[model samples]
Target: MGPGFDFAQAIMKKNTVIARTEKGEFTMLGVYDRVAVIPTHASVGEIIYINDVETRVLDACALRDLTDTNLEITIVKLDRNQKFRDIRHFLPRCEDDYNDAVLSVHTSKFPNMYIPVGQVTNYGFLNLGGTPTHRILMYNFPTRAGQCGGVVTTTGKVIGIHVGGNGAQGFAAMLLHSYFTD
Candidate 1:
């Protein structure tokens, strides 16, 4: 029952999919032509299932654990199934002109439930369970744990990935286009 519903609906039907490992499952966001992103912490092993279709982890971003921020994402390759080809169609574009308003499409724990409207509180280092990180988009709304690995968009362009949150505030990691450029 909000304006973000329209954007969320289109994204849910197009840009979103499920990623599963032997350990557990989480949401993945289609970024480039065929590449998609999921939280590195959510990844358990090499073998994975995309929307229930079997696939292999061709490669993962080397900077995942190497970076000082310890950004949480791993790009995975999808199988050559014709169904997956459409992932490129509705790929969310990156926005250089930043906006304060954003929407988080939570699928894993709350599917078709409600889209959380978040206003960017800030984007810098804040103590996250004692440690501090950078380039994090802080949100005013309380984003649940299920929002992890979900897409955060503003004006139809992807801003980043919903990483984690404390009960009172939510945060996201910038989804760098460079993650797929090379």
Candidate 2:
């Protein structure tokens, strides 16, 4: 846990879902744990409470969309002064494999809706004895450019690099593209 990083009672919401924050109507995206990946402009006190138990229809819908998927989210906080690191170790590999496949399939068919990256490759998974997991073969997306240092999610769970891409496919796509692409 880091300073001012209270996980006690936080509100949760789905990606692209807007909530009234002190700053204004801000979109919320749930990340790993109770951590919500919000815009950099969102202040700590600006988040509003949507429901109890931190579950809602939006969350359910998001989960449904992300069923059987695994993602690589960047870790912003850690014990001590540790630098940022990928947190795939906290999730199951089966989920990662499923997510990778889904991403690949979606990107291929619907290029407009689902942006296709180059290709997914093996990125070592820290959770499974440093085993390899599929990497998103894309790079930067417009929506994720400034938020590169922040967390990313699938079904609102923080996965990995919201701004990076897999080294394999010549880094042709981005997180948004890789996520939506088949």
Candidate 3:
């Protein structure tokens, strides 16, 4: 036998199904994607991103829905002495009109969170090129009674933190990398 060679093959088989029960009958739900959470705080007159991946925020009044829920929100870190900044002076009239006409209007008594445009830059996953490729969206204002981290999607997909909003656009972070890695 020149260098004698031998080979063997075997077959393997396995089958399994995962399921859950709501009350008594089994339910078949689709797979769920994982979400990441980043801790950040809110301050007066500050722009912040609200998590709105699961619940729909039709107007500003719907913001009270966000509370004690695990969310992957991106917020800017500020110093303790940071004073509140007013965005009304910088907001365009058209945008304000849209907010007033379309979004729900809440009193200005609540503490506003500050979110910078740069935060959006850091919202998505960073690639080897050091750039983000996804965009994040925020929901309406959430109430304190609700969980801190609420789901942020219309289809029950968790997206970002449910931080409150000022008179401007809502803020959120896209967990692109987190989802991919997990």
Candidate 4:
């Protein structure tokens, strides 16, 4: 009975898909149309299997640098034949807009999905190559590798996409509404 039980379940069942590589599987967040986001670390190549349907990596935010920018999101084109659900309607564009972060990560365990809730701690500047991007930190939200590119939400709306961080902290890119619509 955590904060976003209903919201998390809705997101887990509809907004997420299993993105698989030759090595392993992770979660991909659906934004709009045929567009979805995944972590570059989990995948960077051209082809990936989305719920077993092969799809293309349309564009990975070319601005990301592992050393300087913790932002590691990649855009993928879901198969035209596959179903898509838009989750951009309620995502926040800035840190001050929301306080709670509900993170849903896909796992192979029995429950299949794991949700973690935490409070927003602060915001930081992440240099994605030459562009400065907004990064939001959460209060020690427990995250795992599979959680990369996971959607972050408040009580009932999305705030950002979980990028990466250790157990002590978690950071997310406050992806603007424009990022999904345009």
Instruction: Please name the candidate that would achieve the greatest TM-score relative to the true structure.
Output: 4
Q: Per-model C-alpha lDDT, please? A: 0.62, 0.27, 0.23, 0.66
TM-score of 3: 0.24
The window of 10 residues in a row where model 1 has the poorest summed lDDT is: 83-92
- Tens digit of per-residue lDDT, candidate 4, span 104-181: 777453235555656776566754334455454555765656566667766768766777666667767666565566
lDDT of 3 by residue, 112-168 (tens): 212122112223222212322233343343334222222222111222333333334
Instruction: Give the lDDT ranking, best first.
Output: 4, 1, 2, 3
Local accuracy of candidate 2 as per-residue lDDT tens digits, 16-134: 22333354333334333333333323332422533211222222111112333323322111111211233223333332321321111101112112222222343432221132223
Query: Could you tell me every candidate's TM-score relative to the true structure?
Result: 0.76, 0.26, 0.24, 0.77
Better of 2 and 3 by lDDT: 2
**Residue 32 error for model 3, in Å?**
9.7
- What's the TM for model 4? 0.77
Where is the poorest 10-residue window by lDDT in model 4? Answer: 127-136
RMSD in Å for model 3: 23.1
Model 4 stretches with alpha carbons more than 4 Å out: 58-70, 109-111, 126-134
